[PDB]
Structure formats: C-alpha cells, structure tokens
Write a protein that binds this ligand. Structure first.
Ligand SMILES: NC(=O)c1c[n+]([C@@H]2O[C@H](COP(=O)([O-])OP(=O)(O)OC[C@H]3O[C@@H](n4cnc5c(N)ncnc54)[C@H](O)[C@@H]3O)[C@@H](O)[C@H]2O)ccc1C(=O)c1ccncc1
Ligand SMILES: NC(=O)c1c[n+]([C@@H]2O[C@H](COP(=O)([O-])OP(=O)(O)OC[C@H]3O[C@@H](n4cnc5c(N)ncnc54)[C@H](O)[C@@H]3O)[C@@H](O)[C@H]2O)ccc1C(=O)c1ccncc1
Ligand SMILES: NC(=O)c1c[n+]([C@@H]2O[C@H](COP(=O)([O-])OP(=O)(O)OC[C@H]3O[C@@H](n4cnc5c(N)ncnc54)[C@H](O)[C@@H]3O)[C@@H](O)[C@H]2O)ccc1C(=O)c1ccncc1
Ligand SMILES: NC(=O)c1c[n+]([C@@H]2O[C@H](COP(=O)([O-])OP(=O)(O)OC[C@H]3O[C@@H](n4cnc5c(N)ncnc54)[C@H](O)[C@@H]3O)[C@@H](O)[C@H]2O)ccc1C(=O)c1ccncc1
Lengths: 268, 268, 268, 268
C-alpha cells in the first residue's frame, strides 16, 4: 500500500503549484511518503503553495548556492524528521539559467557569470545536495534529480542544456559517492512541461523566437513520443520520480530515466 | 497493495528456476499480477519449474520461431485469461545464440545460419511477440524485453551482443507500434546473472577463454557498479521489469532501463 | 599528394553512378588510391558504371551472401593487386532490406526470412568482408562500412534501421579482430543521399506514406544539420570515408563517423 | 601536398612540448598550415617552447577567462595573419580544473568557485573562442576542441569529467553558431596522454589514490583499445585534430571524434 510507504523524502524545488516538484511531492504523499520540503527564497509563498499537498510537510529553506544552508541542512532535516530517523529519498527539482544565456538569445552573449550561476544551481547543487544529505540517508535510499536530455543541442534552452549535460555528468559521480551509502542517484529526463516559466517563455517572455522554438520543440515532442507527450501533465514525471524513489528500480544508479513519452528514442 | 495488482501479464522465457523470467514471474506474482507463461520446447519441465511460483499460471507453448505458435498466441492467451480480458503486460525474456558464434570462439566463424537463428529468437521475436500480443493488450499496457547493454563490444558474447543491439533497435520500433495501443515497449538491460547457461559458460562449457572472459566481465561489473552487482541475484532485475510492467514508468517507451548496478554509467 | 596515395583499397557496393560507393571510389581514386572493386549480381552493368571512374579498377564479383565468393575473395584480390601486395583499405558500401519490411509498410509484417536477408547483407556481411579480407590487409589498414544512425527509430527504414544497429554492433567486434592486424574498422553514418533506390522510395516505390516519411526525414535533416545537408551530394560522405581510409584518423576504431551534416548532434 | 596546405590555423593551449596542442601545432605545420598560437600566462616560456615547432608562428596571449583578451583576439590575429586574411582552423586545447576537485580527492569537497573556474576554462572558453573567432573565419572552416569521453564517470578526473560533459554540450551549440559561417565545430576525445600534468598526477602530485586510478585508467585503455593506446604518443590525436581541421570531414559537426584507440567502443 503506497509505492513510497514509510519513506522519508526530501523534495526541493517547489516554487508554484505547477512546479514539477509540486507534482512529485503530491504523488510521493499519495504514495505514502513522508516529506520534508525545501524552498529557496519565497518561503511564505512556498508554504502557501505546499499547503495544497495532500499532507503537511515541514518546509525548510535551501538556497543551494548558500553554503550555510547546505551546511545546516541535514541538521535541519533530522530535526524535521526526528533524531534517529534518516532520509530514504531526496529530490532535486532545481534549475535556473539567467540572461541573455537561455532564450532567445545568443548563446555567445551569455556572460560566464550567468552560465556559472546556472550551472551552480542546476548541476553543481545536485552534488551539494547529495553531499549535505547522504550522511542522513538510509541504505536502499534514492536521490533523484530532474533532468532533460541534453545529448543533442536544441534551440532556446542553450546554456540550460549545457547545465543539464553537466548535471547528468554530476549525477554519475554522485552515484559513486551515493553507492557507499547504499544510495542510488538517478536523473529523470522529462519532456517539456508547461510550468509557469515555460508558459512564460512560450508566451514571449524571452522573445518571439525563443517562444516559437519551444512551441516547436513541444509539438515535435508528442509527435515523436510513441505514447505522446502531454506538456500540461507533470504527473507521468512525478510518478517516474516516485518509481526511482521506490525500491522498484534497485539496480539503477548514475542513470537517467526518460519520462519523455519515449520521444528521445525516436528521431521522427 | 501489489505493484502489479490486477494486471494480467504474459511472461516468456522460463526454462529453469534460475531463469531471469522465473524471477520476473515470481516477483510479478508477489506483486499481484496474474500470469500466463509461455515456454518453448520442454513444457513438462517448464510446468514442473513453474509449479514453484507463488501462484498457478497457465503455461502456453511458444516457440518464437514457429509462426503457427505466434499466430495462435493471443487466441490461446485470451482462452487462458478469459474472453473479454486482455493483457496488461508482456515479458520477453528470450534469448539464444548457437555456435561457434558466442564463446570462445571466433566471432568470424559463426555462420550466418547461426547468427540468424540467434537474432530471430533474441531480437526479431520481440517484434513477433509484440505483433501477436498487442491486439490483446490494454491501453496503459507494458511490453518488457530482457536486454544487456551492447553499445560496446565485449569478449565472449559476440553475436549475442549484436543480437541485443538489433533488439534494442527492434524495441524502439515496437514502441512505435505499441504506442497506438497505449502500450509501452521497453527493455531491461541487466548485468550478468548466474543463470544456468551462464554458470556453464564460466565453468568452461564454451571453452576456457570464454569462461575467463565472462568471469572478468562479472568482476569488472560490481567493481564498476556504484551499488555493486550481485550476479547470483536476479531479483533487482525482476523488480525493474516489474517497475516497467507497473504504471510507475508511464512516460517511458522505446527505452532501456539499466538494471545493472549502474555499471554502465561508470567506465572504471 | 593524394590523401590515399599508394593505398590499395577494395570498394564494394557500386551498383549505379549515384551509389555512395561510386563516389567513395571516385574520391579515393582522385586521392591516389588504387582500387579493386567488387560488385554483386550485375557485373557487366557495374563494369560499365565503373568505367566512368577516373581510373581503371579491377572489378571482382562479390555476393556477400555467397560463401564461395567470400572464400575466394582475398585470392581474387591478391591476383588483381599482385602477389606480395596487400589491401590498405576495404569499403563496405552494401545494404539491402526486402519487403514488406522497409516502407511503407508494417514493421510487424516483414517475415523473418526477409529481415534475415537484410541483416545478412547489411550487417553480417561486414564481418564476412573483414574475415575474407583482414588476412590480406596491411598494418595501418582501414575497413570502413556505410552506416546510418539507428540509435533512434524513425519512419520507413524500419528493419533497415535494425540492420544498421546490428552493423554498428558488428563493427565494434570487427574492430577487435581488425586490431590484431593493425587494422581499423569504422563506420560512416551518412545522412540521406538521393541514391536511385532512395529517389524511387521518395517517388512512391514503396508507397505514399513511405515516400512522404523519407521526404520529411530529408527536410528535417538539413534543418537540423548546423552545416546543412545536401542529399543530392554523396561527396562529403565519400570524403569522410576517405578520411577514415587515410592515416589521418589513426586512433579511431570500432567507431562511427557521422557524415550527416551534424544533424545527429541536434534534436531540432 | 599537406593535409592542411594553405590553411591558417589558430592553436591554443601550448604550455609545454608535451602539450597535446604542441603536437597538434607540429603536425598542422608539417601538413602545411600556417599557425597563429595563443598562450595563456607564461608567454616567454611558450615562445621558447614553440620555437621548436617546424615553422615560426606568431604567439598571442589568450587568457580565456580574461574578456579583454577575447575582445581583442580576432583583431590581434588578423594583425598576425594579415588584414583580408581569415582563419580556416581554430584549435581549443585548453583545460584546467583546480583543487580539491580533481584527484584524489573528494568530488564533494570541490568548492563551486573551483568547479566554476574549471568549467570556465575547460568548457565555456570553447564558446568564447568560437565567439571571438568565427567573425574572422572562412567558410569551410573548422573549430576543434580537445575532449575526453565523459559519458561515464571514472575515478580521479571528477569535476574535469563534468567540465568535459559541459564542453561536449557547448560544442553542439557552437556547431549551431559555427554553421552560419560555414564553419564546423567538433571535439576530439583523446585517450589519456602522458602530458606533464598527467605524469605528475600518476607520480602522486594529487595523492596516491589519484595516481593509482589514472594508471589503472591508462592500462585499461590500451587493453580495451582494439588498436592499443600509447599514452606517450600524442601524435595519433594531433593527426585526428588535423583530420578535423582538414576538408576531409566536411559533413561532421557538433560532433566528437574519438582518438582513443577505439577504447570507448569496447567495455572490456
Ligand atoms: N519543461 C520543464 O519544465 C522541465 C523541467 N525540468 C526540471 O525540473 C526541475 C524543476 O523545474 P520546474 O518545476 O520546471 O521549474 P520551477 O521554476 O517550478 O522549479 C525550479 C525550482 O528551482 C528552484 N531554485 C532556483 N534557484 C534555486 C536556488 N538557488 N536554490 C534552491 N532552489 C532554487 C526554484 O525555487 C524552483 O522551485 C528543474 O531541474 C528542471 O530543469 C527538466 C526538464 C524540463 C524540460 O525542460 C525540457 C526542456 C527541454 N527539453 C525537454 C524537456
Ligand atoms: N547474464 C544473463 O543471464 C543475461 C540475461 N539477459 C536476458 O534475459 C533473458 C532471459 O535469459 P536468461 O534467463 O539468462 O536465460 P534462460 O536460458 O533462463 O532463458 C532464455 C529463455 O529463452 C528461451 N528460448 C530460447 N529459444 C526460444 C524459442 N525459440 N522460443 C521461445 N523461447 C525460447 C528459453 O526457453 C529460455 O527460457 C534473455 O533475453 C537474456 O539475454 C540479458 C542479459 C544478461 C546478461 O547476459 C549480460 C550479458 C552480457 N553483459 C551484461 C549482462
Ligand atoms: N540515403 C542513403 O542512400 C544511405 C546509404 N547508406 C549506406 O551506403 C551503403 C551503400 O548504399 P547506397 O549507395 O545508398 O545504395 P546502392 O543501392 O547504390 O548500393 C547498395 C549496394 O549494396 C549492394 N548489395 C546488395 N546486395 C548485395 C549482396 N548480396 N552482395 C554484395 N553487394 C550487395 C548492391 O549491389 C549495391 O551496390 C549502404 O550500406 C547504405 O545503407 C547509409 C545511409 C544512407 C541513409 O540511408 C540514411 C538513411 C536513414 N537515415 C539517414 C541516412
Ligand atoms: N590525458 C590528457 O592529457 C588529456 C588531454 N585532453 C585535452 O587536451 C587539451 C590540452 O590538454 P593537455 O595538452 O593535456 O594539457 P596542457 O597542460 O599541456 O595544456 C592545457 C592548456 O590549457 C591552457 N590553459 C589553462 N588555463 C588557461 C586559460 N585561462 N586561458 C588559456 N589557456 C589556458 C594551459 O596554458 C595549457 O596550455 C585539454 O582540453 C585536455 O583536457 C583531453 C583528454 C585527455 C585525457 O585527459 C583523458 C582523460 C581522461 N580519460 C581519457 C582521456
């Protein structure tokens, strides 16, 4: 009863109710997991968002660039879950890439300070979280990060794709570390999901050509997906994360599960 | 209650109690699936083997090279599961590669008749089964085949690796077909499992250098696996198959889940 | 002077003057290679085609399914090139997939006899040729086969994609064998080239939907290619084969060079 | 006469005479290319090193983290090569990863400031160089960066592997940009080369376990390589870079050529 029954799971990256992490949290709760959530900057907001989750979850502040947040995370979570209790699950659902770098908008014009911020938050923070959290994880545990397939360049996502390549590589190293703890580390490569940032982009937040490109990306995904892809539905990805959080992929680590409708297996 | 609760699942490829498919079947049953099994040539044997499964399952003959078996499969399974009932799950756990082709034993010396047999049974039969069975599958359904990662050549497995490359490619096409039915098609790439054939090979069935190579392959796997690999335990793979058979990887098709301890993410 | 100056190179697979192998041969000759050609069934035709090459080349019959052709190849080529002379280069530019299997036309409807023929000629023949020819190759030698990227399923090519997956896998094994001889074995993954068969397909030889699909494949290639792709020009692929035949990729084997305009690095 | 005859080629990353870029430069010169070299911090040293090249080459300072260096590069090179002359070739042979991050030495202990420096110099600088230099490149041009295969985690290289994953991803984006100029952008994934830094590491510069690991990596490479790998010889990689710099891989971009002895195609 419950895929995640009895599992304590930290889920980062809720910012709105359309956040992939919101759905992960909701599905994890539906599946019996006890959550601790982390949020970055707008904690009153995140608290209010997360109140809609089917169960209460302690919400902790984690700015993955901080250091002090990271240093105290583990302490703050064992406090939230009770001393002598450890994490079974950690969800990294964190990403960010500044400007220009990202849409439209010339790849070449992103200053390294921005790329570096993006990679910090989007890639390196995966190692950071695993470092902060593996000491309070149980054998049989699972770390899952949110990915998208960056093995081919694409329009618009630019430096964010680079950040995901870095992340996928970080993941395979976290796996090496996580393994000593009996902990899996895996990524879920999602197809495009109409998250608030994503609808803003397709709406022209980042320029016409950025939005046009993402819309094209979305349509081609779905077409390519042998089972289709619904970008308005984060649930198939929430669930895939949960499958990774579960004991049902026990021999899978340093790996990437594609929750993308199979689009990446296809070409056309 | 039960990952696979209420699911009707055909599981091929039980030949002994150390068959990966035996474990898949056992775990599937533990998880509430109702099975139909297929067996190839030694049905009295397979019946006797499968009696040890936690639940009875109708056993059907399927020689995947036959044609008549394939043509009548679907009819025979709807008979076994009851008219108006369809499959939710199909497990292809079938492989075979003759001689020389396979260990030791020169790759170049395998006649095409043997390679072709191997690919028939090991790769093409995946399309065959999906063809025979998709007409009696439910939307939300899942086809899983047993794979090993053939993206790099290795000693000993030779033509069988080629057969797995062909299979992985067949899988991505079955996905296209399966998708029209709302059915996923995926592969599980397992690490080496001490199946009876495999212990025979490491014992020198196919020559000293074949066995030496597989033993080396086994050790390097485990070392590479950030979570280790236990070749004597098919369970982590049974379970991964079940995860694919479940509704917990709903956005994954034409794909390969590596139940290999993460060895393939590693290098060294 | 001449990329391939002083190199003896066997080039298979000329059937017309729009054959990729015709261009390979022409470019190889322009680059100073001395060729031996093999042709399959229509040798008077192939002789007449190959007369247009900038230099004469002995033409040998090689039906890669034969066995006797294979057994006598090596003898027939050392005869053509002079005893005490060996091959430096071997070009496999051979492929074939029967019906239905290939366009339109249901993947599931290709009988294994056809798939097996396709894989024989398209994949296994790569091992066959390397087996026949490595005994008459020089250290520093190079075997190149013609590939297309089958890592993702696509419309229309179906079983031929499977055949290319098998081939890529065969290639990595031939590399292991070739290596003992100081010989590289590599594949060139070409984008779509308007070869006579290919224009026939886009013209509806294999049905409307087959042709529509290939045309779509062609356009998307070119769009995806950061340097574009001209399907009417086999030359960039001829040249890439030559680069592999040369001493300029000396540390590359079991590998695939994508002469595809970079389309495969792109997504969209 | 000369693979690179008449080509103007910028080659970065000479620091010693065992630098991969030194060999690239030497082979490029042997092949008729006219070089402009860039060097980072020790220009008197680099000048003295580069005096041993078979031909004189203007040496320009390029600290790829600078910005002003980048902004003025293009101007400084057109000055070195003569107004109305453009680059045909650009070689990025630049990498760096600080401490701990790199050997031994816990992956988790590298502060982001160090990782970010590493990625700046090792990955982002590839975009930087392409940005600075594409405006002074000729159609038919070629940008080549030095890579190693980071698709699997490995001991010791840690954050540097991540940096290479980022680089490979950067490369596929530079390809998109380079393409508008008729310029290819590709990476060469080299096996391990006993460069001065590398011998220092295997000598214990970074700790015993770092050196042990690299030595193991080196041996396994060579064993895996169907044509062997000689880590003391950068020439097969110099040459592969040259092949990319040449017109002989005209349809290859956003891509990675493995000059690794085929080790990456192998497993074991
Ligand atoms: N379409 C998508 O929404 C998408 C999302 N993801 C991943 O899902 C994860 C969650 O993203 P989301 O839910 O879409 O976006 P979101 O904006 O809801 O969440 C991102 C989260 O990151 C958090 N964050 C930002 N900075 C920090 C910081 N310093 N410290 C802590 N937290 C911080 C932020 O608070 C927010 O909660 C990210 O890793 C995504 O990159 C992965 C892939 C896709 C997808 O982008 C895609 C893209 C291109 N091709 C195919 C598929
Ligand atoms: N070590 C392993 O045992 C191994 C097994 N698998 C897959 O698991 C599946 C089951 O294999 P197993 O359980 O090991 O072996 P098994 O001998 O128990 O089962 C193979 C089954 O195929 C059946 N079969 C043979 N011919 C026919 C036919 N004409 N019609 C119907 N059925 C037929 C046969 O009856 C038997 O039940 C096969 O696809 C394997 O290739 C996949 C990978 C690995 C693994 O090999 C590996 C290999 C190399 N590197 C890494 C990992
Ligand atoms: N578009 C293309 O033309 C294409 C061609 N190639 C490869 O290039 C090689 C040459 O093909 P081609 O020049 O297009 O076609 P072709 O018809 O000119 O040559 C095929 C050759 O195979 C020969 N052959 C057939 N049967 C036998 C036999 N029993 N023994 C000996 N020879 C035999 C036949 O005589 C002919 O000379 C084949 O391996 C192709 O698959 C590889 C890829 C592509 C490309 O197909 C593509 C496809 C899908 N996505 C992307 C790119
Ligand atoms: N073994 C190797 O030496 C190796 C080298 N490469 C690449 O070859 C390229 C050259 O490296 P190398 O010749 O070995 O080392 P090197 O120390 O000779 O050259 C690195 C160059 O980078 C330069 N550099 C550093 N910082 C800056 C800066 N701010 N601005 C401008 N230049 C700067 C530095 O001056 C030096 O000339 C780098 O991209 C390497 O990463 C790629 C792969 C391998 C290989 O590492 C390997 C590794 C793991 N698995 C398999 C193979």
């Amino acid at each position: 009863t419950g895929l995640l029954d009895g599992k304590r799971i930290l889920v980062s990256g809720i910012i709105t109710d359309s956040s992939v992490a919101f759905h992960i949290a909701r599905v994890a709760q539906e599946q019996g997991a006890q959550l601790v959530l982390t949020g970055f900057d707008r904690l009153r907001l995140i608290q209010r968002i997360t109140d809609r989750l089917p169960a209460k979850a302690p919400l902790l502040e984690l700015d993955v660039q901080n250091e002090e947040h990271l240093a105290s995370l583990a302490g703050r979570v064992t406090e939230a879950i009770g001393a002598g209790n450890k994490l079974d699950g950690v969800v990294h659902s964190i990403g960010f890439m500044p400007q220009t770098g990202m849409g439209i908008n010339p790849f070449f014009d992103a200053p390294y300070a921005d790329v570096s911020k993006g990679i910090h938050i989007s890639a390196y923070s995966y190692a950071s979280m695993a470092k902060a959290l593996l000491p309070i994880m149980n054998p049989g545990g699972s770390i899952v990060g949110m990915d998208f397939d960056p093995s081919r360049a694409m329009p618009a996502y630019n430096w964010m794709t680079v950040a995901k390549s870095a992340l996928e590589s970080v993941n395979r190293f976290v796996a090496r570390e996580a393994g000593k703890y009996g902990v899996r580390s895996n990524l879920v490569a999602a197809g495009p999901i109409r998250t608030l940032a994503m609808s803003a982009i397709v709406g022209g937040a980042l320029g016409e050509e950025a939005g046009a490109q993402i819309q094209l990306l979305e349509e081609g995904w779905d077409q390519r997906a042998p089972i289709g892809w619904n970008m308005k539905d984060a649930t198939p990805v929430a669930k895939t994360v949960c499958a990774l959080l579960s004991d049902w992929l026990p021999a899978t680590t340093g790996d990437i599960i594609y929750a993308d409708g199979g689009a990446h297996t296809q070409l056309l």
